[PDB]
Structure formats: structure tokens, C-alpha cells
Amino acid sequence: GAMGSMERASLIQKAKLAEQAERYEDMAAFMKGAVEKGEELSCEERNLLSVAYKNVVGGQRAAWRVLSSIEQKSNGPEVREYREKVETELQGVCDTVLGLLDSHLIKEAGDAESRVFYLKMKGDYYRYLAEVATDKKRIIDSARSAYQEAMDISKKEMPPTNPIRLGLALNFSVFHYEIANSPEEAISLAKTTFDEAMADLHTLSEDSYKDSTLIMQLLRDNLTLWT
């Protein structure tokens, strides 16, 4: 690893600087290096890892969608070739993230908050692979299984307003609607998540209340689009 010679603390510090500088590819490289030191990640460090790769793959997904739309309309080799280039790079980033989760973040996650976070990430990165897949069936099943295991743990171990639990349910609902062709499942999950969070807000501080309601707004926004 190109980051093998840098101290763990220095990698984390530089990931935070890269975030402020909007240098997300650098941020992801620093956080991959930190993960590869073999120690568990704190909550803050898990958030840095997630932000970095979400931004990298987000740009790739946005580009792929533009190119796939151009390719569909035109139906020379250039559009297909360039779409394939972007697709391959996106798949490579997803495979890198999934590799970090499998070697060895998930197995070493020795409490529910960490394990849920990583299983949610696993679902997310299989979902991104599914967006470009044609197998697609196997990828969809891997995403669903990761998300469902995360949901089972989150329902036993976290309150309904916990932001990781909320974000997991949100993203699993998106999986159902956009990937699995299961819009009824998406709507049911978003609705139950929203209602159970609503009924738990009374337990929260002003700060946690703002945290939770921000994510609940996204559940509401999807339900408005889907119904």
C-alpha cells in the first residue's frame, strides 16, 4: 500500500484536511491506508471513510448516468467505450470498498453500532454495483442480504431514531424501489421507519432531534415521490 509508510494518526489528519479541501480521491486513499493499519475505526473515522468513498463513487455514478443516457439515445464505438471505462472504474472503487469490509472491518466489528455501519456500507456498495450490472441477480441478492442483516441487528440494538438505523432503512428502501423492482416494499419500509422514528422523538435532546428529523425528511421526500 502506498500509504503503508504513513502513521495512522497522520492518515486520519490528512483525510480531514482533504475533506476540507474537497479532495475526495485523496481522502479515500488516506482512509484506505488507515483501515489497512488493521485497527478498528472510531465513529468519526467510520464517517470519514464513508464520506470519502461516497463522494468518489457519487461522481462516477453521475458520470455513468450521463453516458448511459447518451448511449441509449444513439441506439461509432466511442460512447460505449467511454461508458465502459467509467463503469470499470466505478466497479473498481466498489470492489475496493467491499474488500476493506471483507478484509477485515466486518469480522472485527465487535459491537452493534460498528457492525451495522459496515453491513450498511456493504449493502450500499453492492447496490452501486447493481446499478451498472447486467450477474445482476447475484449482486442484488448480496446487497439485500447485507442490508437485511444490518436491519435485524439495528432493530434489536438501536433506538428507532438512531441516525445510522435511519440511514440504513432509507438506503434499503431506495434499494427496494430502484434496484429490486419492489416499490411496495420500499414504501412500506419508509413508512414504518418514519412512523416509528416520529414516536421516539420525545426521547431526544434538541441536538439529537435535529439529527434525526433531518434524515426523516428524506424518508418523507421519497414517500412523496413514490405515492
Binding site: 440511514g167 432509507l170 438506503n171 431506495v174 424501489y177 430502484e178 428524506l218 421526500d221 421519497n222 415521490l225
Partner: peptide, 6 residues
């Protein structure tokens, strides 16, 4: 398009 976690 559906909105995922931000």
C-alpha cells in the same frame, strides 16, 4: 430519482 442518505 429516489434520494439516499446524505
Amino acid at each position: 430519482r429516489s434520494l439516499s442518505e446524505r
